[PDB]
Design a protein around this ligand. Sequence first.
Ligand SMILES: Cc1ncsc1-c1ccc(CNC(=O)[C@@H]2C[C@@H](O)CN2C(=O)[C@@H](NC(=O)C2(F)CC2)C(C)(C)C)c(OCCc2ccc(CN3CCN(c4cc(-c5ccccc5O)nnc4N)CC3)cc2)c1
Lengths: 104, 149, 87, 117
Amino acid sequence: MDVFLMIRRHKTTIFTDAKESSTVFELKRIVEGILKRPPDEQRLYKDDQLLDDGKTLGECGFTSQTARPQAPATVGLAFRADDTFEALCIEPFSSPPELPDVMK
Amino acid sequence: PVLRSVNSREPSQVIFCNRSPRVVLPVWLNFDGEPQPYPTLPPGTGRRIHSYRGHLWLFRDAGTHDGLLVNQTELFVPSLNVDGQPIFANITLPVYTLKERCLQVVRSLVKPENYRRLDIVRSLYEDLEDHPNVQKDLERLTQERIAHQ
Amino acid sequence: MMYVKLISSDGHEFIVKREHALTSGTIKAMLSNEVNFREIPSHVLSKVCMYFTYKVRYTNSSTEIPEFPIAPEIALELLMAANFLDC
Amino acid sequence: SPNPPNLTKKMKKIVDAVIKYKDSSSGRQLSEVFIQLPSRKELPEYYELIRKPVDFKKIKERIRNHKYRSLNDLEKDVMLLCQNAQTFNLEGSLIYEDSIVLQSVFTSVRQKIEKED
Ligand SMILES: Cc1ncsc1-c1ccc(CNC(=O)[C@@H]2C[C@@H](O)CN2C(=O)[C@@H](NC(=O)C2(F)CC2)C(C)(C)C)c(OCCc2ccc(CN3CCN(c4cc(-c5ccccc5O)nnc4N)CC3)cc2)c1
């Protein structure tokens, strides 16, 4: 079963997919191939909770119902800064304007 | 006309299955290729119906007339039943273009008289006014059949 | 696996599979690895990338095709982005 | 020439009961499709095949104008209607099955109405 994700860090968003049975460590290897940061230099999060390397994406709560192509699940990403990790920081997207009177 | 039902007079049992989130309007093309509206199907409902060999069908959203797929294509024609087996017609949404899907959502929220009041480029007012039409899709499908020969 | 970078008007960087970004005819014409969109803001460009994934996953598919959802608040801007992007 | 009043009333009672008949489980009026023939413009293929087209509207008119001289003349036109629908639509169609039930309703209703007098 495929799961569709947005791996987000600062103003960077990676759109990717993986199997529900694949692990958090295998997801860090995908990030490594894109951003050239090794797994030991990454912390992955779901709803501000740190994800264990050995857990499957399904065990973290990423399923076909919660991580859809049209509505992907967000995975927070923090990189190691020298000897310590940076704080998890995801810059929000912009906001649309107010809904017009004709659409109400 | 190229796209029409044949007056075969050969019975054929069909199952119409609405696997779309839309209220479906089955459309039967008569013996002169003219589209005929049939009773609607709510989302998730299936109905065993009687039709005939070489009879041509298409499916739309009953409220907006947006085009739908049947067995992953635009047209459905049942042949004879092999040994009394019903013919299945799985009705689903197509993968619409993002532009067409945006036009659908804007038409559902804004009334036709209030389209030109929106803060958007004027080339989109004509796109919004050019509502999906069975007759225009039959021309496109006929032109595709003539091109392929 | 080749990826491309799509940058919004407000500086958000969207890294998407090359094959998925080619869903857009405007991006297809530009690529033939990085693309800057001075007029498309991040809340719209993120939604465009979700459409690219949706398009590639469900075109010629046998699984049930779900509706692509669009909130009323983003519909007008997303329409203009889709019109410009040819997708 | 007029028919006896008792004959014309028996004809009206049988046709009204066949027209008003409803299914025991669904409550659908089976005669509704048979009340009026489709127009010659709507369905010319019906007229190409059916030589003697007839509907419940023409049957009621024929009772009023005394064209039927007996319960058998009326029955002939109800069986003609039902056979026309069967010949045109063929087995497997709901309309074919509805016409079979209406032929049976005509005979059950006719036997009951004749036992009253
Ligand atoms: C429930 C439901 N949910 C979602 S879709 C749906 C549904 C699906 C199917 C049907 C019924 N089937 C059909 O209409 C099939 C489909 C297509 O193949 C064409 N066709 C046909 O029968 C043609 N027949 C033929 O090609 C042949 F018969 C020559 C072989 C035609 C259209 C009669 C020329 C249905 O039906 C209910 C809805 C529905 C469908 C159509 C119509 C309009 N009709 C047309 C004419 N009709 C008839 C009247 C009489 C008649 C009348 C008076 C006296 C004597 C008579 O014999 N006899 N035959 C008729 N067919 C009544 C009105 C109305 C209601 C509902």
